[PDB]
Amino acid sequence: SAEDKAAVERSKMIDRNLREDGEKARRELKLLLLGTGESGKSTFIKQMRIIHGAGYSEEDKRGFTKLVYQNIFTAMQAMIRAMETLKILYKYEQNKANALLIREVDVEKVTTFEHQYVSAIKTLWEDPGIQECYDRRREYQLSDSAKYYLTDVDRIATLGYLPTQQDVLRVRVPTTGIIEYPFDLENIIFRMVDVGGQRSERRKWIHCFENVTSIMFLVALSEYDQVLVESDNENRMEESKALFRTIITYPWFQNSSVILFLNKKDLLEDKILYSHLVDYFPEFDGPQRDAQAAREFILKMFVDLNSDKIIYSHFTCATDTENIRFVFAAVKDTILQLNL
Amino acid sequence: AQARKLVEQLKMEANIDRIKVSKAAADLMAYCEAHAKEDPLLTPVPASENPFREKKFF
Amino acid sequence: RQEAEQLKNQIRDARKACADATLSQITNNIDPVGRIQMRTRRTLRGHLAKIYAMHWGTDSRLLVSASQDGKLIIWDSYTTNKVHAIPLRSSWVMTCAYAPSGNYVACGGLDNICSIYNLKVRVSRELAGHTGYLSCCRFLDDNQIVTSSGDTTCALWDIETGQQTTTFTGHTGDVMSLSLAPDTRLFVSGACDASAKLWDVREGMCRQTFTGHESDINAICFFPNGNAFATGSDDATCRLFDLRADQELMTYSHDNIICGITSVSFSKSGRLLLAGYDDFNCNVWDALKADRAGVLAGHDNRVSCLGVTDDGMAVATGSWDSFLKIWN
Ligand SMILES: Nc1nc2c(ncn2[C@@H]2O[C@H](COP(=O)(O)OP(=O)(O)O)[C@@H](O)[C@H]2O)c(=O)[nH]1
């Protein structure tokens, strides 16, 4: 029958398309980024778009504008909360009202950065009490880009403000679904995946990631002096390391290559001058105020786990495009060598 | 606030009419019995009535 | 929360006052179904990665399947002809659905979006609003679809406007599955709070809550007359719940099956309850007597999904092994 014949042909045309897509799929490598919040996952993805993708046009940059406003509000809300938590007093009486104004901002509905809010932000930021709180950020959770944005508040508040590439690299992009960023490099499609935004039960989706090509685990080197009071004063690095161990021991990641990025090496250089590693890891036998000894120690500690599996480790600064260019060139070679 | 909300929810769940399990069970059994003949997975049909065995398709 | 104890107790005592006999007691005299021995009649080849979901069309002939290969495939089961292949924006798919009309399908997953595709093939609506993964969706008609989510909510959507008409709140854990009543007035959901909930679609209220012994419910399905439903859980157990008697009637389990259940469906008469298991098999249970009647062993990885046609003539299994099989 003519209609039957045409349905057969349609099916075979679909089979052709699925074969073609299958050929392409075999030229895709999935790189699953893992690591605790603020470790550098989203920044790394943005660097891949700068280095190997379409980058950020002026129109792209405009799409991030309200998110920069939102980062300022979130950062100041965190400090306002910490003034209460840590019982630090504000110097300036108006700052009770300024803090209340900022505390009540609905961050998700922010689309503008109007003058009374900018003024409140700046007046809070210069309050010596808020500066004390900022100096004690080791004791709570504050974005590592808070100071950056608050320092540049005037630029950000100026009529016509257009985010810089640095602004884009540092801004929090809110999502509670999966992040996938694919890019082409040497006839391979790298599919970068980040599940860090998801807030649901991992047990119900971790098997979506059986046998990914590579796991890229990020740890913030600069968290060495922070503890989890609720977890019997577990060092934050120890918690990151425990998560890492769960990952490298997971039965369906045994075929995955494991890349470890010890990130925020710049912030370690800053912090090590005044916050001593031996106070948090007394086994540390290197000199004080020495970033190189600190990061070497942290690397060794991180991979001291109890498999003949190689862990491919790199120190990084994910906000430094040149650094990520250099490190990812070596990583790409590891991944391609293993998979071809 | 959320407690008041749960109390109202529980009020709503409690104030329903329930039947005997004996009756609920009888009703399920009767449904099965009334539709047994129409169930091809329970009572397999002739090969000539099975589209997945008819040569005209595959 | 003294009042909330007095009510929780009132519900328990009321249910006990109805428990005058058990289903198994009532069904003890009826004949067993005997050995159910279905054979593989079709093998549907074309997906290139795990299949996560499938749904039959109402013509008991076409079906849609969804895979991590990033495709929906619509198949003519009778011929095995492929009728459509739809490339997805997000390959992280967990559910698909066939509209009763045959004119649309839907799917979604870790993108937290329920995407609608017009078969008469481009994406025609992206329904955004869930804040966690889309676990299940079912069309009421071409204009409305109900969803369940990892965000602990279900929702009814107006497809034209893209808005949630009704949000169904009450679960305290990820919702994994839903099933519409035969007449579409009610639906049930099953969640990681180990509860199943009955909802009024149009009022948007939870009418009744059922507990599944503190194990996640991964799958749920109405009994054909709409007065009962079944669940499948991580604890290797299926369970039957009656709406009017407001309580569990039966469990289906063997001590030597310990793996999770992914999927459940009744046969057309309701006499058989079919369930898909992590151990790569489908087990067929006597819904009335609780005996295992038969097994479908045709896959090399988890059975992730299953469906029985509206005409009752076949069961489909879908699997992590990349294949669907049609059985009877
Ligand atoms: N100074 C500095 N900032 C960094 C570095 N890596 C990430 N950041 C910033 O720290 C914040 C948290 O990093 P992000 O990439 O969002 O982490 P994620 O939560 O894992 O996605 C952002 O503002 C980043 O731009 C780094 O090596 N040095």
Q: Cα A121 to chain center, whole Å?
A: 25
Distance CA C167, CA A24 (A): 40
Catalytic position from the list A198, A288, A292, A334: A198
Check: CB of residue C283 under 8 Å from CB of residue C290: no
Check: CB of residue C73 under 8 Å from CB of residue C85: yes
Q: Edge to edge, what strands does the sheet with C281-286 contain?
A: C261-266, C272-277, C281-286, C292-297
Written as six digits, the tokens of A330 are 């070596």
Contacts of C143 (CB under 8 A, 6+ apart): C158, C159, C160
Distance CA B10, CA B13 (A): 5
Breaks in chain C (C–N > 2.5 Å) following residue: 120
3-state DSSP helix/strand/coil % of chain A, to nearest 5: 55, 15, 35
Biggest alpha carbon–alpha carbon distance for chain C:
62
Helices (H), A39-104: 41-52, 58-62, 65-85, 94-103
Written as six digits, the tokens of B36 are 């047994």
Check CB contact of A251 with chain C, cutoff 8 Å. Answer: no
Name all domains of chain C by residue range, CATH numbers in brackets.
1-328 (2.130.10.10)
Check: CB of residue C112 under 8 Å from CB of residue C128: yes
Distance CA A116, CA C165 (A): 37
| Whole-angstrom Cα Rg for chain B | 23
Written as six digits, the tokens of C100 are 């009763």
Query: Residue by residue, what is the 3-state secondary structure of A91-122?
Result: CCCHHHHHHHHHHCCCHHHCCCCCHHHHHHHH
Distance from the A255 Cα atom to the nearest Cα atom in chain C, whole angstroms: 17
The neighbouring-strand residues paired with C147 are C137, C155
Check: CB of residue C228 under 8 Å from CB of residue C247: no
- Helix, coil or strand: residue B34: helix
Task: Compare all CA atoms of chain B with the CA of C310 and give the residue at the minimum distance.
Answer: B39
In angstroms, the Cα distances linking A183 to A192, A258, A261, C213 are: 8, 20, 20, 46
Q: Which of C92, C110, C115, C186 is nearest to C151 (CA)?
A: C110
Distance CA A195, CA A308 (A): 27
Distance CA C316, CA C205 (A): 33
Which CATH superfamily hosts domain A65-162? GI Alpha 1, domain 2-like (1.10.400.10)
| Contacts by C180-187, CB closer than 8 A, 24 or more apart | C180/C138, C180/C140, C180/C146, C180/C222, C181/C222, C181/C226, C182/C222, C182/C224, C182/C225, C182/C226, C183/C226, C184/C140, C186/C226, C187/C138, C187/C146, C187/C154
In angstroms, the Cα distances linking A82 to A21, A72, A123 are: 52, 16, 17
Query: Residue by residue, what is the 3-state secondary structure of chain C?
Result: CCHHHHHHHHHHHHHHHHCCCCHHHHHCCCCCCCCCCCCEEEEECCCCCCEEEEEECCCCCEEEEEECCCEEEEEECCCCCEEEEEECCCCCEEEEEECCCCCEEEEEECCCCEEEEECCCEEEEEECCCCCCEEEEEEEECCEEEEEECCCCEEEEECCCCEEEEEECCCCCCEEEEEECCCCCEEEEEECCCEEEEEECCCCCEEEEEECCCCCEEEEEECCCCCEEEEEECCCCEEEEECCCCEEEEEECCCCCCCCEEEEEECCCCCEEEEEECCCEEEEEECCCCCEEEEEECCCCCEEEEEECCCCCCEEEEECCCCEEEEC
Distance CA C65, CA C318 (A): 8
Catalytic position from the list A194, A223, A225, A238: A194
The neighbouring-strand residues paired with A312 are A259
Give domain limits for chain B: 1-58
Q: Which of C83, C48, C37 is nearest to C64 (CA)?
A: C83
Task: Show residues of chain C in contact with A198, CB under 8 Å.
Answer: 110, 132-133, 150
As a residue count, chain B comes to 58
Pick the CATH number of B1-58 from 4.10.260.10, 3.40.640.10, 3.50.50.60, 3.40.50.1820: 4.10.260.10
Written as six digits, the tokens of C247 are 């309580």
Distance CA C315, CA C40 (A): 10
**Is A223 a known active-site residue?**
no
> What are residue A85's phi and psi, to 5 degrees?
-55, -50
Distance CA A299, CA A261 (A): 10
Q: How far apart are the two ends of chain A, measured CA to CA in Å? A: 47
Q: Edge to edge, what strands does the sheet with A257-263 contain?
A: A179-185, A188-194, A28-34, A214-220, A257-263, A311-315
Q: Which of A203, A208, A247, A252 is nearest to C234 (CA)?
A: A203
Distance CA C232, CA C221 (A): 9
Q: Which of A154, A185, A221 is nearest to A29 (CA)?
A: A185
Task: Compare all CA atoms of chain C with the CA of B4 and give the residue at the minimum distance.
Answer: C1
* A33 marked ligand binding residue: no
CB pairs under 8 A between A and C: 87
Written as six digits, the tokens of C223 are 């009994």
Pairing, β A214-220 against β A28-34: parallel
Ligand 1 atom nearest to A170, measured from its CA = 25
Check: CB of residue C67 under 8 Å from CB of residue A25: no
Check: CB of residue A325 under 8 Å from CB of residue A51: yes
> What are residue B5's phi and psi, to 5 degrees?
-65, -40
The neighbouring-strand residues paired with C97 are C106
Distance CA A130, CA A107 (A): 20
Architecture of domain A31-55+175-339: 3-Layer(aba) Sandwich (3.40)
Residue written as tokens 């608050």? Answer: A150
**Is A172 a known active-site residue?**
yes
C-facing residues of A in 182-201 (CB < 8 A) are 195, 198-201
Ligand 1: distance of its center to the CA of A171 in Å? 9
Distance CA C245, CA C14 (A): 10
Distance CA A250, CA A273 (A): 38
Contacts of C198 (CB under 8 A, 6+ apart): C186, C187, C188, C206, C207, C208, C209, C210, C243
The three-point CA angle C146-C151-C154 to 5° equals 20
Check: CB of residue A27 under 8 Å from CB of residue A209: no
Check CB contact of C322 with chain A, cutoff 8 Å. Answer: no
Ligand 1: distance of its center to the CA of A137 in Å? 16
Q: Which of C33, C284, C31, C315 is nearest to B42 (CA)?
A: C33
Whether C85 and A18 lie within 8 Å, measured CB to CB: yes
Ligand 1 atom nearest to A33, measured from its CA = 20
Check: CB of residue C190 under 8 Å from CB of residue C179: no
Give domain limits for chain A: 31-55+175-339, 65-162
The neighbouring-strand residues paired with A181 are A192
The three-point CA angle A107-A108-A112 to 5° equals 70
Distance from the A17 Cα atom to the nearest Cα atom in chain C, whole angstroms: 9
CB burial of residue C60 (10 Å; 0-12, 13-18, 19+):
middle
The three-point CA angle C273-C277-C280 to 5° equals 125
Distance CA C165, CA C85 (A): 30
Question: Sign of the CA dihedral A241, A246, A248, A253?
Answer: negative
Distance CA A290, CA C166 (A): 59
Q: Which H or E run includes A179?
A: strand A179-185
Q: Cα B35 to chain center, whole Å?
A: 11
- Helix, coil or strand: residue A334: helix
The three-point CA angle C149-A253-A301 to 5° equals 110
Distance CA C268, CA C245 (A): 22
Check CB contact of A20 with chain C, cutoff 8 Å. Answer: no
Check: CB of residue C38 under 8 Å from CB of residue C296: yes
**Is A43 a known active-site residue?**
yes
The neighbouring-strand residues paired with C23 are none
The chain B residues in contact with chain C (CB within 8 A) are 3, 6-7, 9-14, 16, 18-29, 31-32, 35-36, 38-42, 44-45, 50-53, 57-58
* A58 marked ligand binding residue: no
Check: CB of residue B51 under 8 Å from CB of residue C313: yes
Contacts of C2 (CB under 8 A, 6+ apart): none
Distance from the A311 Cα atom to the nearest Cα atom in chain C, whole angstroms: 27
Written as six digits, the tokens of A1 are 């029958």
Contacts of C85 (CB under 8 A, 6+ apart): A14, A17, A18, C46, C71, C72, C73, C74
